[PDB]
Design a protein around this ligand. Structure first.
Ligand SMILES: NS(=O)(=O)N1CCCCC1
Ligand SMILES: NS(=O)(=O)N1CCCCC1
Ligand SMILES: [Hg+2]
Ligand SMILES: [Zn+2]
Length: 258
């Protein structure tokens, strides 16, 4: 069978035929118009508590790679900001381009970054991820832009395992990785209600998008671009341009923490 992806024949313009929510009222990503976003003094301080994070594995899922965490206890959590309660880190992944001038999902005044990091968390009041994605406040995704410049030292362990997970369905052990090494200095952010940016495109996400990008080197992003969408032994389809473009804002407001 065919499957959704990022090519001409199965990319974002096709997703609505199997995932009609693709044309919904709270789809992600969106363009962040900085002049229209409003400071919200009701936002509480944002709390990223990752000191006890336990990474387990890295997986090439045929769309991106996921760095997976042990979420059987509150070992790595996001709280505060726009969030009510506690959200547990389950995985992170990236979206990136074929060229440095595109790759992000969110845009900032229509600016595209080279890539975007998504740290995915689920609301512990719903007990598991699968139940959380049946809820309008089930997930919180912390989004971080990547620009090309100086290397991000904390990213290099991710870059160096990618050769071992080149093709779809390959995984590798990935213990003792500290995701705090992927953050910028500032936690200043924009927030809005949205969706998963991949099928099934479920409208369950509180998005928290940091204003400050991280810098990664050209060499680091070049290694992202050597991954494959295809499986082993299949003709090579480089894993590039695995981003969804901006969707209509509709009846939403983006709030700023700053
Ligand atoms: N609607 S979809 O899931 O993106 N896909 C399009 C290509 C054929 C298989 C279904
Ligand atoms: N790209 S995303 O919206 O962060 N992600 C959340 C977890 C499920 C797959 C989609
Ligand atoms: Hg939902
Ligand atoms: Zn994502």
């Amino acid at each position: 069978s065919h499957h959704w992806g990022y090519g001409k024949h199965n990319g974002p313009e096709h997703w609505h035929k199997d995932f009609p929510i693709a044309k919904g009222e709270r789809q992600s990503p969106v363009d962040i118009d900085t002049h229209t976003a409003k400071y919200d003094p009701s936002l509480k301080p944002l709390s990223v508590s990752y000191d006890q994070a336990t990474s387990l594995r890295i997986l090439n899922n045929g769309h991106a790679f996921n760095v997976e965490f042990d979420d059987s206890q509150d070992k790595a959590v996001l709280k505060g900001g726009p969030l009510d309660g506690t959200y547990r880190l389950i995985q992170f992944h990236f979206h990136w381009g074929s060229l440095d001038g595109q790759g992000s999902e969110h845009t900032v005044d229509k600016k595209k970054y080279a890539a975007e990091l998504h740290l995915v968390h689920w609301n512990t009041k719903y007990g598991d991820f699968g139940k959380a994605v049946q809820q309008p406040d089930g997930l919180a995704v912390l989004g971080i832009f990547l620009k090309v410049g100086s290397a991000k030292p904390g990213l290099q362990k991710v870059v160096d395992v990618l050769d071992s997970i080149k093709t779809k369905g390959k995984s590798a052990d990935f213990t003792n990785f500290d995701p705090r090494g992927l953050l910028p200095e500032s936690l200043d952010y924009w927030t809005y209600p949205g969706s998963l940016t991949t099928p099934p495109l479920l409208e369950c996400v509180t998005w928290i998008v940091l204003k400050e990008p991280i810098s990664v080197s050209s060499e680091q992003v070049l290694k992202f671009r050597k991954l494959n969408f295809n499986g082993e032994g299949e003709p090579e389809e480089l894993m590039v341009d695995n981003w969804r473009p901006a969707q209509p804002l509709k009846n939403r407001q983006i709030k700023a923490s700053f």
